[PDB]
Amino acid sequence: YASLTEIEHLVQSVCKSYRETCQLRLEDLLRQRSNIFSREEVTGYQRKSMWEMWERCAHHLTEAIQYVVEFAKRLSGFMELCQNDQIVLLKAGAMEVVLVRMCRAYNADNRTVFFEGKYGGMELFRALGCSELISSIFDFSHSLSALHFSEDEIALYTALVLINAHRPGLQEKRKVEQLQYNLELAFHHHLSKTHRQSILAKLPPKGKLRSLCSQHVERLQIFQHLHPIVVQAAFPPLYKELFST
Amino acid sequence: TLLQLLLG
Numbered sequence: 712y713a714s715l716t717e718i719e720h721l722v723q724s725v726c727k728s729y730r731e732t733c734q735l736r737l738e739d740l741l742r743q744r745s746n747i748f749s750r751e752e753v754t755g756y757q758r759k760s761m762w763e764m765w766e767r768c769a770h771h772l773t774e775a776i777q778y779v780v781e782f783a784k785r786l787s788g789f790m791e792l793c794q795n796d797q798i799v800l801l802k803a804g805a806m807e808v809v810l811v812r813m814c815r816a817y818n819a820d821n822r823t824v825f826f827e828g829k830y831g832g833m834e835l836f837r838a839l840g841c842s843e844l845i846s847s848i849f850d851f852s853h854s855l856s857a858l859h860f861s862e863d864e865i866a867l868y869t870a871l872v873l874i875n876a877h878r879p880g881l882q883e884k885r886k887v888e889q890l891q892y893n894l895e896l897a898f899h900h901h902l903s904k905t906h907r908q909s910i911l912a913k914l915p916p917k918g919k920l921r922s923l924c925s926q927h928v929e930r931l932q933i934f935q936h937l938h939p940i941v942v943q944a945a946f947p948p949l950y951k952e953l954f955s956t
Numbered sequence: 957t958l959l960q961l962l963l964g
């Protein structure tokens with residue numbers, strides 16, 4: 712039973728861990744909104760091979776994931792879980808966290824995302840050959856931006872995305888349950904101060920994030936059958952460990 | 957594994 716002070720300093724350690732591991736500062740993202748891929752540039756991207764577009768994306772996701780691993784490592788409670796359970800939660804949740812973080816890099820006004828140094832719409836990504844998945848991600852980021860998360864809310868919400876007692880394969884399900892609740896308490900406690908609790912009913916449905924991540928792993932299965940050597944020779948080993956079977 | 961390495 713965490714006391715209000717224990718819950719307050721859990722808030723503290725989560726928001727600090729996120730500050731230190733947020734990859735890009737929000738203001739650097741907002742500043743770049745005016746930098747948008749031009750017609751020729753978007754065509755250039757569309758005309759790339761599938762193998763080259765996937766390989767670029769694999770690198771950029773791996774880089775994002777490295778920051779999430781760090782976020783978890785600094786998360787109060789996470790390192791106190793058993794090794795197996797740490798792996799289980801990261802394997803299931805690293806991508807989910809990244810997708811949540813990425814709404815920061817989504818510009819709802821022109822419907823673009825920050826990618827390779829500029830902003831571009833979902834058609835930039837055609838060469839990947841998973842336009843349904845990509846359009847789903849754009850819709851998801853669109854839906855998250857309407858909640859106007861602060862950075863502290865992202866910290867708290869991503870901690871919860873990661874600390875999810877419902878993942879299969881846990882050796883100590885009960886420990887994770889306890890940390891999750893303390894984090895739910897932490898999130899509620901923070902939302903009460905700011906008088907922000909009305910975002911809770913507008914949060915993405917349970918399952919929606921897991922669904923997006925499932926589609927991604929499936930589209931990588933299609934791609935890997937088409938280019939098994941590229942994945943083996945050029946994909947980051949971490950990406951392969953996380954998303955490859 | 958890599959996750960294990962990244963974690964320590």
Ligand SMILES: CCS(=O)(=O)c1ccc(CC(=O)Nc2nc(-c3ccccc3)c(C(=O)c3ccccc3)s2)cc1
Binds near residue numbers: 734736824
């Ligand atoms: C995330 C921490 S942050 O500080 O907010 C932050 C740091 C660095 C960036 C630049 C960056 O990496 N942008 C990318 N955007 C997509 C992307 C692609 C399609 C739809 C939406 C996003 C990337 C992918 O490869 C990818 C491929 C398939 C599925 C999903 C994604 S990589 C952005 C945010």
